[PDB]
């Protein structure tokens, strides 16, 4: 984002407040736009944004989109008990596959990884 008077800034989402914009805030924004020499968004563009938000909020996600969002949050997932159990089970399956294939090098790494992940309370 960017203030008109100030410069560009990268901000996270939680900084924004759910409270509505007050009259002096919008007036100060208009004064900053006039100082920089900019205009306000057109009413046609305002309606286009409103329709875009309503369509996006009322949209129905597809299976592929839902899986992509789930994979994205799984990449963001630091830890979750169900997911840790599933990962440990998958690692155990990979470990038995490596043991049955007589691969003495992979199995040590999988055992070390399981030891690091494990030791619950």
């Amino acid at each position: 984002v960017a203030f008109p008077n100030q410069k560009e800034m990268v901000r996270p989402l939680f900084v924004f407040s759910d409270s509505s914009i007050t009259h002096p805030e919008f007036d100060l924004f208009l004064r900053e736009l006039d100082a920089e020499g900019l205009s306000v968004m057109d009413l046609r563009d305002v309606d286009y944004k409103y329709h875009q938000l309503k369509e996006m909020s009322s949209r129905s996600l597809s299976n592929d989109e839902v899986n992509s969002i789930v994979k994205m949050k799984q990449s963001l997932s630091s830890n979750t008990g169900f997911n840790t159990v599933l990962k440990k089970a998958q690692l155990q399956e990979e470990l038995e596959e490596a043991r049955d294939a007589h691969d003495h090098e992979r199995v040590a790494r999988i055992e070390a990884e399981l030891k690091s992940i494990g030791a619950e309370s």
């Binding site: 989402l13 509505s20 919008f26 057109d42 409103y50 938000l53």
Partner: peptide, 20 residues
């Protein structure tokens, strides 16, 4: 081409809960 009023901006309020 008309300027946007306060109510027009209020129609497109997108809260932090809505962002999440």
């Amino acid at each position: 081409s008309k300027p946007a009023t306060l109510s027009d901006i209020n129609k497109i309020i997108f809260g932090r809960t809505a962002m999440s």
